[PDB]
Amino acid sequence: PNTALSFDLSSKKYGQLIDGRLVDGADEMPVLDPGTAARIATTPVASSEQLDQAVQAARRALPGWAALGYDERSKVLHAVADVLAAHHEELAQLTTLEQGKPIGEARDDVAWSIDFTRYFADYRLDTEILRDDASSYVELRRKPVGVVGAITPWNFPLFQAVYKLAPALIVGNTMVLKPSPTTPLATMHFAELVREVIPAGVFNVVGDGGDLGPLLTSHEGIDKVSFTGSTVTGRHVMAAAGPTLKRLTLELGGNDAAIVLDDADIEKTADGLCNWAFANAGQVCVSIKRIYAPASLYEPLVEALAQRVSALTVGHGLDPLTQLGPVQNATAFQKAREALEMAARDGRVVAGGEVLDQPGYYVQPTLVRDLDENSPLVREETFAPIRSVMLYDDLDDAIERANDTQYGLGGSVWGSDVERAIEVGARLNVGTSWINHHFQLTPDVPFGGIKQSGLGAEFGRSGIEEFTNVHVVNLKR
Amino acid sequence: PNTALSFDLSSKKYGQLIDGRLVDGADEMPVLDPGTAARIATTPVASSEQLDQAVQAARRALPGWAALGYDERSKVLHAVADVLAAHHEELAQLTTLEQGKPIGEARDDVAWSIDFTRYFADYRLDTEILRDDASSYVELRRKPVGVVGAITPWNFPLFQAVYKLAPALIVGNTMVLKPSPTTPLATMHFAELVREVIPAGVFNVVGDGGDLGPLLTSHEGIDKVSFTGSTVTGRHVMAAAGPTLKRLTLELGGNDAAIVLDDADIEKTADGLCNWAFANAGQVCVSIKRIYAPASLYEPLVEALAQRVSALTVGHGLDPLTQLGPVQNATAFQKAREALEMAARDGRVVAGGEVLDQPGYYVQPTLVRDLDENSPLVREETFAPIRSVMLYDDLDDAIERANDTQYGLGGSVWGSDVERAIEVGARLNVGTSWINHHFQLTPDVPFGGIKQSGLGAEFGRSGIEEFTNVHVVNLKR
C-alpha cells in the first residue's frame, strides 16, 4: 500500500550522522520492504575509516558533553523527544516499511521511545555520602563510562536505538550506533532529524553492510558495548570485547514460557496468550514461545487459541486492517518454513501451518498441539509466528520443563489466584516474571536476562548504573 | 626463624576441600618460603576431574544453601569469623611463611578477613516494591547468581579468598575457589579449619599447578567468575568466559599515581608516601607506584623520601624487626632485577637499587628520581619495591601524566587544602581517589577499577549486588 510520507522515499538520499554532519557512505545498501519484497530505499554503509571517524568524534565530544551537567543534557533529551513526537507518524511508517510490523505496533514503538526518552531526560544521579565521621569523608560519585558502541537488531530498530540512547546520554556518555543491515531506515532517518538537536559527535550513527559489527565491538576507542541480538552473536561479542576489557551489556533473546494454572479464565488468558505469543510476528526476545496448560484446560484453551490464531488478519503492515505482518527478512522466512515443516512432522497443527501466497515473507500464524517434547521447535528458539501448546500433569513438572532451557529471559504465569501465580512465577529462572500479562517494559523497571540470555539490566537504576562507573573519593581527616 | 605453629608444617598433609571432605590431590606441589627459597610444605594440586567434582558439589549445595535463609547463612558466616579469630596468629604465621610479608602485615590481613566477614555476615538484601498501584504490582527480588568460581592472587592470599567468599555466600551463592599456585598454604589450612563449619559443598577449594585457571573460567558449571590478578590474564579470562556468557568481576591491578600539591606537609606526606608505596614490598594492585611533586617541593620531598626508604629494614617476615620482606616468588624476583636495571638505565637512583646477596628473593627498596617519562618503569606496572618521584610544572600537567596510563585502579592527592585536593582527586581516571592517604579498603565502600584495571565492584552495595541476579515479578491487576 502507499504511504503517508511527506517526501519521496525511493529518491531520498540518506547520510550517516558523524560529528554533526551528514556523511555519504563508502558504499550504499538497498532497503527492501518485507511486505512486498521490493526495494524501497537506499541507505549508506560505512567503511572502517568512517567507523574510526565516528569513534573519534564521540571521544572528542566526550569531555564537553560530560562537563555539561545533568540539567543541560536534560534539555537536549527533551528536544529529541520533541522531534520524536513531531515526526511520530513518519517514523512509525518508516519502521513498518522496513521492519514489516503492523503500523499500529510501530506507533507503539515510537510512543515507547518518547516515554523512555522523557523519563531519562528527567533522571538525576547524585553523589552519595557513604561516610561522614570524625576520621573519614567518603563519597561515591557516578561518572560516565565513556564512548558507548550500541548495536541494535531488526525486530524493534528505532525503539531499541532510543532506549540505548536516552540513558547513555543523560549520564554523560557519547555514542556510536550501528543498526542491523536489514533495518537502517528508521534509525538513519531519526539521526537526520536530530543532527542539530544533539551536540556534534555526542551521537553518531554508521551504516552496516553486514560486516561492521565485529569491528565496532573490538574498537580501541569504544569503552562500553551495548548489544541486542542473538545469543550466538552475543558470545562472539563477549569474546571480541575481551582484549580491550570492555564494559558489556547484552540483550540476547530467549524461550519464554507461559504456564497456565487450573483456575485461569479461558477467554482472558487465551486473549493475552494470542497477543503476546504472536506480537511482532513472534519476533521478540521476550515473546511467549511455549505455553504449558494443565490437563483440565488443554482442550478448551487450545481451541480458543486456534480460533483466535485463525482469526488473525495477515497482510502488509501499512494496511490498517492488518494484525500480523511478514517476518522481517529472507533468512527469517526460510527459518519459518523449516519451523512449519517441523510443526507438521512433530505435532498436530490446529491453526495455520503454511506459507501465504503473497509477494513477501508472509507466514500464516500457526498453532501446534501434541508436540513431541524434544522437537527442535520447542527446544530451540523460534522467531516466527509458529507456536506450541504443551500439556502438563503437575505444577512441578510444568515449572521444571519451563526452566529446562538455556535462556531464562522472561516468563509469565496465568491464573485467577494471584498469590499462587506469584509463587509460581518466582520459581521461573528468568529475569522478569509477568503474571496476568507478558512483555511489559517501562523505564523505571529493570529489564535483563540471566543464564544465556544476557549479562546486565537495561532500564531502571540498575540500568543507569550500567552506563556509569563508580568513582570513590575517600578523605582521611 | 622460628615458627609459632603448634605442629610440623613440613610433614603436614593438606587436602583440598571438596563437598565437605578433604580430598587428596591428583598431584602434589612444593610450597617454598620466599625468605629462604626452600621448600616448607607440600600442598595438593587438582586434576580437571577434581575441578568437575568441586563444581558439581557446589551446584548440589546451591538449592539448599540459598533456601536456608539470610539468618541461618549469617550464623555460618559468623562461625567462620570465629574460626579466623581462634586461629589468628596461626594463619598470620602461615601467610607470612608462604607470602613473605612482615608478620605484622599478616596479622593485619587476618584481622581484615575477620572484619570483612562480620560486616557481610550481617548484610541483608530485601525485596523492593517498584510499583504498588491499582493497575500493577511490581517487586524486585535478588537471587543468587549460582556457583561462583573465585581466583585469587599471591598478594593477600587468605584475605582475598575471604573477601570473595563472605559477600558471595551471604546472598546464597556457592563457591569453588582456586588460590594462586605459589600461595596455597594459608588458604588450604583455613579451608581445613572450616570443612565442618561450612555446610558441605557450599565452599570448595582446589589446588592449582598452573593450569587450572583457564579450566575454571570456562567451566560449564560456573555461572560467575570473580578474578583478581594480572591484566593480561584478565583479558584472557574475559575471552574464555565468552562462550558461556559468564557473569564477571575482574580486579586487575594498576599504576596508582600520587599527586602532591604545593601546600603539602613534607614530613607527613613523606611518611604517607613511603608507607603506601612500599607496603607489602610494592606488591599491591593499588600500591603507590608514581609520585608527582611540584617544583617548589621536589628536592625536600625527594630527600625525606630517600631517607625513609633507606631506613627500611629488609629481612625475613617472621623477624619482628623486619619492615620490608622479600618478593613472593622467583619470576617476580626476576622482574624486580629487570626493573633495577631499567632504573639505573633511565633514572637517578637515590636509595637502594640492588638485590641483597642472600638465599631468597630479597630486593633493596629503591627510590628513583629524574626518571625518563617514556621509560617502561613508569609506563608499566612494577610489582616490586622500586618507586619513582617525578617533577611536574603545572597541576594540569600532573593530572594528565597521572592519567596517561592504561590502568586507572586508584590514585591519591596530598595537600593541606582538602577542597582543592578533592577537586584534583576527582580529575583522576580511577576507581578510587584517596585524599591524604592511599590504599584504604573497607567492606561498606566500593572498590573497583576502570580502564584496563577492572570490570566490576568488589565491596559495598555495588559488588554485593554483583553476586546476585535481578528477578522482576510484575503482576497486572
Tell me the chain A residues in contact with residue B243 when contact means C-beta distances shorter than 8 Å.
235, 239
Tell me the chain B residues in contact with residue A461 when contact means C-beta distances shorter than 8 Å.
none
Tell me the chain B residues in contact with residue A448 when contact means C-beta distances shorter than 8 Å.
469-470
Cβ separation of B469 and A431 shorter than 8 Å? yes
Cβ separation of A472 and B236 shorter than 8 Å? no
Question: SS3 of A32, please?
Answer: strand
Which residue's entry shows cell 598433609?
B13
Residues 6+ positions from B215 with CB-CB distance below 8 Å? B48, B51
Backbone angles phi, psi at A402, to 5 degrees: -65, -40
Q: Nearest by CB to A445, from B138, B141, B431: name it.
A: B138
Instruction: List, in order of start, the domains of chain B with CATH numbers.
Output: 16-252+454-476 (3.40.605.10), 256-435 (3.40.309.10)
Backbone angles phi, psi at B350, to 5 degrees: -105, -10
Cβ separation of A238 and B245 shorter than 8 Å? yes
Q: Look up residue B324 and give its DSSP letter.
A: B
HEC secondary structure over B98-110: HHCCCHHHHHHHH
Backbone angles phi, psi at A444, to 5 degrees: -85, 0
What H or E segment, with its residue span, contains residue A295? none
Cβ separation of A421 and B231 shorter than 8 Å? no
Give the closest-approach CA distance of B48 to chain A in angstroms: 23
Catalytic residue among B90, B98, B105, B285: B285
The CA radius of gyration of chain A, in Å to the nearest whole number, is 23
Burial class (CB within 10 angstroms; exposed 0-12, middle 13-18, buried 19+) of A374 = exposed
**Inter-helix orientation angle B185-193/B157-170, to 10°:** 40
Active site residue B251: yes
Tell me the chain A residues in contact with residue B129 when contact means C-beta distances shorter than 8 Å.
none
Helices (H) and strands (E) in chain B, counts: 15, 19
Residue B26's CB is within 10 A of a number of other CB atoms, namely 17
Cβ separation of A435 and B476 shorter than 8 Å? yes
Residue A288: beta bridge partners? A256
Question: SS3 of A347, please?
Answer: coil
In terms of CA atoms, which chain B residue is nearest residue A423? B473
Q: Look up residue A459 and give its DSSP letter.
A: S
Given a contact cutoff of 8 angstroms between Cβ atoms, the answer to whether A48 and A40 are in contact is no
Question: SS3 of A441, please?
Answer: coil
Method: X-ray
Cβ separation of A445 and B418 shorter than 8 Å? no
Active site residue A274: no
Residue B39: beta bridge partners? B32
CA–CA distance, A167 with A171 (Å, rounded to integer): 7
CA–CA distance, A170 with A166 (Å, rounded to integer): 6
Question: CA distances (Å), A134 to each of A129, A472, A476, in order?
Answer: 14, 18, 9
Cβ separation of B476 and A436 shorter than 8 Å? yes
Residues 6+ positions from B179 with CB-CB distance below 8 Å? B152, B157, B161, B187, B188, B205, B207, B208
Extract the C-alpha cell encoding A284.
521478540
In terms of CA atoms, which chain A residue is nearest residue B147? A451
HEC secondary structure over A347-389: CEEEECCCECCCCCCCECCEEEECCCCCCHHHHCCCCCCEEEE
CA angle centred on A420, ends A391 and B123, rounded to 5°:
120
In terms of CA atoms, which chain B residue is nearest residue A222? B451
Given a contact cutoff of 8 angstroms between Cβ atoms, the answer to whether B202 and B134 are in contact is no
Task: Suggest the residue from B275, B399, B432, B472 to mutate for an interface test with chain A (most A CBs closer than 10 A).
Answer: B472
Residue B351: beta bridge partners? B367
Which residue's entry shows cell 547468581?
B145
Q: Nearest by CB to B235, from A236, A243, A457: name it.
A: A243
Backbone angles phi, psi at A5, to 5 degrees: -65, 140
What does the DSSP assignment read for B399-440? HHHHHSSS--SEEEEE-S-HHHHHHHHHTS-SSEEEESS---
Cβ separation of A238 and B236 shorter than 8 Å? no
Given a contact cutoff of 8 angstroms between Cβ atoms, the answer to whether B249 and B466 are in contact is yes
Tell me the chain B residues in contact with residue A450 when contact means C-beta distances shorter than 8 Å.
469
Residue type present at position A227: F
Cβ separation of A434 and B252 shorter than 8 Å? no
Extract the C-alpha cell encoding B380.
608499566
Task: Suggest the residue from A472, A473, A476 to mutate for an interface test with chain B (most B CBs closer than 10 A).
Answer: A472
What does the DSSP assignment read for B342-383? HHHHHSEEEE--SB-SSSS--B--EEEES--TTSHHHHS---
Given a contact cutoff of 8 angstroms between Cβ atoms, the answer to whether B455 and B409 are in contact is no
Long-range CB pairs of A395-398 (<8 Å, 24+ gap) are: A395/A259, A395/A261, A395/A424, A398/A259, A398/A292, A398/A294
CA–CA distance, B163 with B159 (Å, rounded to integer): 6
Question: SS3 of A366, please?
Answer: strand
Which residue's entry shows cell 520447542?
A378
Question: CA distances (Å), B156 to each of A350, B98, B161, in order?
Answer: 64, 11, 8
CA–CA distance, B344 with A241 (Å, rounded to integer): 38
Which residue's entry shows cell 562472539?
A236
Residues 6+ positions from B206 with CB-CB distance below 8 Å? B16, B18, B46, B50, B51, B54, B176, B177, B178, B212, B216
CA angle centred on B338, ends B336 and B339, rounded to 5°:
65
Q: Nearest by CB to B242, from A242, A426, A469: name it.
A: A242
In terms of DSSP bridges, do strands A128-132 and A136-144 run parallel, antiparallel, or are they unpaired? antiparallel
Question: SS3 of A173, please?
Answer: coil
Q: What is the largest CA-CA distance in chain A?
A: 78
> How far, rounded to the nearest angstrom, does the alpha carbon of residue A446 sit from its chain's CA centroid?
14
Which residue's entry shows cell 613534607?
B266
Tell me the chain B residues in contact with residue A475 when contact means C-beta distances shorter than 8 Å.
418, 421-422, 434-436
Strand locations in B152-287 (E): 174-178, 203-205, 224-228, 247-251, 256-260
In A179-329, where does DSSP find H-type helix?
185-193, 212-217, 231-240, 266-278, 298-311
CA–CA distance, B433 with B455 (Å, rounded to integer): 17
Tell me the chain A residues in contact with residue B133 when contact means C-beta distances shorter than 8 Å.
none
Cβ separation of A140 and B445 shorter than 8 Å? yes
CA–CA distance, A277 with A412 (Å, rounded to integer): 11
